[PDB]
């Protein structure tokens, strides 16, 4: 019995007759490119992505952020072409390219990347690490303005915090410093949230440092709602994520229900929900800066747990599920002698009545 | 007469587990003499062209693209002789893991 194809067949467009006149590719690399490009199309049969979690295919993501900086496409392209012509006009660059002896100003590359295309890369990195899925659950923003976070490990020791870096609580014990370009006419809010580490409620996150009403770039001048608290991940379940969220606001936001006391050493009080906070301050706040990093357990976490939080250090462990074994039969057929060891409760000879 | 040895028992070469069956690690999903079903995610390939699951979950079958190994000269020649719009498809058997990797349980609150 035959059935009708539910759509277009893959190799039905090319003709079977006169294969010699039809052009072919002779490169395994070209064939690999073609196959990888065709594997990403929404086919009608059962594919690999549908069974292994393509994330529901397309997702209508809500965009909550600043509009892109409106630039003149014609003038930008003209200036870029002029710069390219000026660069290729040099003969020394051609000599260096021929001799394979040429270097690149990586600092200028990093700066220009942060200026023109850093936001989108940081957005996709945050999507990969699962930032928006846990901060808003339905919306991803674009970090238009940059944000440089730095911790001080000494006098000349400065550790930066990039998107997804691994910074230990030993360096993260003291309050970090933030840097970002902004005029002296706006207001900003910084929020450090720990997405993993809450013992009781898995759907909630902790707050370590919340400071609102930042005049321009002066972060110290702004009023701090919650004092800075060093990270404290569990010893068993490691590699928690800590996210620095920067929101731009238009009006002077005042809030008393979200105000934290000076000690603020209560985990019940340090129970936060970014979704609810953004629902409350959606009229004024707009996310524009994002800086998340990884953090695992170290020797400095015991001090934070004992002296600051007044708690006993909890220890977890990555325990694995027990291996599966079939139902034990009365007469195992062709099974090794160790078959009785798979159902042994303990390796101790049990003497019932003797 | 003239024909001898024409008798030989069957090898039971066929597909063992169908789509939707919950299998465990190590179960032979399908056996074959020639390459009729290729393995995919979490499906190994024995030296006798047998397909066995490596993780515990649900068995699936999908029509996917075929990119041969660059060391196989025959397949490389076939690919290079294929026309511009040809892409080879095969039937890959997959095992979608249902059980999670592990759990974080409290050991001792030190």
């Amino acid at each position: 019995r035959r059935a009708a194809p539910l759509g277009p067949m893959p190799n039905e467009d090319i003709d079977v007759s006169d294969l010699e006149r039809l052009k072919k590719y002779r490169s395994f690399d070209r064939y690999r490119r073609r196959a990888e490009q065709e594997a990403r199309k929404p086919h009608w049969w059962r594919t690999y992505r549908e069974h292994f979690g393509e994330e529901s295919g397309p997702k209508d993501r809500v965009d909550i952020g600043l509009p892109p900086p409106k630039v003149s496409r014609t003038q930008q392209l003209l200036e870029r072409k002029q710069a390219l012509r000026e660069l290729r006009a040099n003969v020394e660059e051609e000599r260096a390219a021929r001799l394979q002896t040429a270097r690149i100003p990586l600092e200028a590359v990093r700066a220009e990347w942060e200026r023109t295309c850093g936001p989108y890369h940081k957005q996709r990195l945050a999507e990969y690490c699962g930032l928006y899925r846990d901060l808003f659950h339905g919306a991803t923003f674009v970090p238009r303005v940059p944000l440089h976070v730095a911790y001080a490990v000494g006098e000349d020791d400065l550790m930066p915090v990039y998107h997804g870096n691994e910074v230990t609580p030993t360096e993260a014990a003291q309050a970090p410093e933030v840097t970002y370009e902004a005029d002296e006419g706006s207001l900003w809010t910084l929020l450090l949230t720990n997405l993993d580490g809450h013992l009781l409620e898995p759907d909630a996150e902790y707050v370590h440092w919340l400071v609102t009403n930042i005049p321009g770039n002066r972060v110290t001048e702004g009023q701090e709602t919650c004092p800075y608290l060093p990270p404290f991940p569990a010893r068993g379940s490691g590699f928690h994520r800590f996210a620095f969220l920067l929101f731009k606001q238009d009006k002077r936001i005042d809030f008393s229900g979200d105000t934290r006391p000076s000690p603020c050493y209560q985990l019940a009080q340090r129970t936060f929900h970014t979704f609810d906070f953004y629902k409350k301050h959606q009229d004024a706040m707009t996310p524009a800066g994002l800086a998340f990093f990884q953090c695992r357990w170290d020797d400095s976490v015991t001090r934070v747990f004992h002296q600051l939080l007044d708690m006993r250090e909890p220890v977890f462990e990555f325990v694995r599920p027990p291996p599966y074994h079939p139902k034990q039969k009365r007469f195992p057929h062709r099974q090794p002698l160790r078959y009785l060891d798979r159902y042994r409760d303990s390796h101790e000879p049990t003497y019932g009545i003797y | 007469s003239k024909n001898l040895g024409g008798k030989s028992p069957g090898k039971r070469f066929g597909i063992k587990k169908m789509e939707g069956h919950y299998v465990h690690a190590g179960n032979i999903l399908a056996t074959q003499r020639h390459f009729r079903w290729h393995p995919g995610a979490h499906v190994g390939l024995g030296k006798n062209k047998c397909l066995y699951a490596l993780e515990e979950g649900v068995v699936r079958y999908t029509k996917e693209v075929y990119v041969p190994n660059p060391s196989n000269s025959e397949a490389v020649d076939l690919v290079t002789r294929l026309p511009q719009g040809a892409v080879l498809y095969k039937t890959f058997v997959h095992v979608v893991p249902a059980k999670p990797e592990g759990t974080f349980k409290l050991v001792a609150m030190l």
Binding site: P5, M9, I14 | -
Partner: peptide
């Protein structure tokens, strides 16, 4: 399978032939 709508998807021998007046 033969009774499935996706029958003959692995068909490739009609794409290459490897076997003047």
């Amino acid at each position: 399978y033969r009774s499935k709508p996706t029958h003959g998807i692995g068909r490739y021998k009609h794409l290459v032939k490897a076997q003047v007046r």
